[PDB]
Design a protein around this ligand. Structure first.
Ligand SMILES: [Cl-]
Lengths: 103, 103, 103, 103, 103
């Protein structure tokens, strides 16, 4: 099993690692129909999204998605340093697959 | 897919962006019949609500609504600065569609 | 729609508003059979409870009751000032209907 | 309804009130099969548990049990002083029925 | 029945206790298909995972898995000192079965 975010990311197609080593700059949350999502940006301008649960989402992935949004909201409020993001680059904003935080 | 709240807001009818750049002054939560909701106000007097989950709302929307109330409660308690709010202006108080927080 | 706790409290029968403007003094939680509830008191001796979830009332009522217990616990831990409580006075301790927090 | 932990505890069989007036010394959590539980200890050596949710527990019981585990974790991490604990003393460690927290 | 993490860990096969007495160094969360897991690291490099769910995990087991992920996330965010870890050593990285935290 992957021991870290980098090996984990290399296991999928259309994913790429982003090394930020910085806290989340802004956090956006929408409850709007068909746009139930979260968007975070960093000071340098990089924007990422936690993708809206569509048909392409099982039931085990639906829970991890809700988990990710909880993680991002609390990481933002506590000014936690996000180290890396593994994202799907075939989507705009890039969609978050994984996150790693290191104090 | 919107990259920010302003663009995401523009995709709906009767919406409106409010720039508060202020912490929530008050938080009111009700569990009373057919009024299971949260109401927030800012020092400027602005009052907003998170609509009661009802008939129109499907499941992904019912949980986004629950997440929004969680978000406002934790934002109120941590004194987080709310930047903008996308609201449906055809309701009173205006109902919240999305929220952005910055730094 | 009601825009504050006093107006919302008035739409119900035999309710009453309590102005505390103080933090919760103590928080009691019970998982014991038929008394799965939370009880809070203020330094002045006022004691309030969140009703135990009964079958006949709808599940949105059940979610709101659960949220209210989450809200009281975190308000207690963070020493948040509670402004007013709207309660059903036909119960003792008085059962909470709504709560407002403001500093 | 009971208005405090002492009165509530006296409504059950084989219960006992423990007065701690101290923060939880340690918190243990287990996800191992049939040992899904939380165990807490205090400086004075007292050890208490939250029972595993067997398929004997009513609907509301399983949910109150999950809440208690959330409460113990957050009380531990915030160093919240625990006032009294009502436990069923016919189990080892004694099983928690109710908890009161007061400053 | 078991009163601490050591006794509880000894009740399983392929488990072992790790004494760390230190805060989590890094936290990794993944929402990716088949890798919906959490990975933690300590300062000396030691890595542990909370295993991805499956039908092997009865429903009560899946709840405890979700709870553990929540616990590691706030423990990391709060820099809480983790004392011991009971892990399954037949997997790589070693899978977490129980955690104990003592300040
Ligand atoms: Cl009993």
């Amino acid at each position: 099993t992957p021991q870290n975010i980098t090996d984990l990311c290399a296991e999928y197609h259309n994913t790429q690692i982003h090394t930020l080593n910085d806290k989340i700059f802004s956090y956006t949350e929408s409850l709007a129909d068909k746009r139930e999502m979260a968007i975070i940006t960093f000071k340098n301008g990089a924007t990422f999204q936690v993708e809206v649960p569509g048909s392409q989402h099982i039931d085990s992935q639906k829970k991890a998605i809700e988990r990710m949004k909880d993680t991002l909201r609390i990481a933002y409020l506590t000014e936690a340093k996000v180290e890396k993001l593994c994202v799907w680059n075939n989507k705009t904003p890039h969609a978050i697959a994984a996150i790693s935080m290191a104090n």
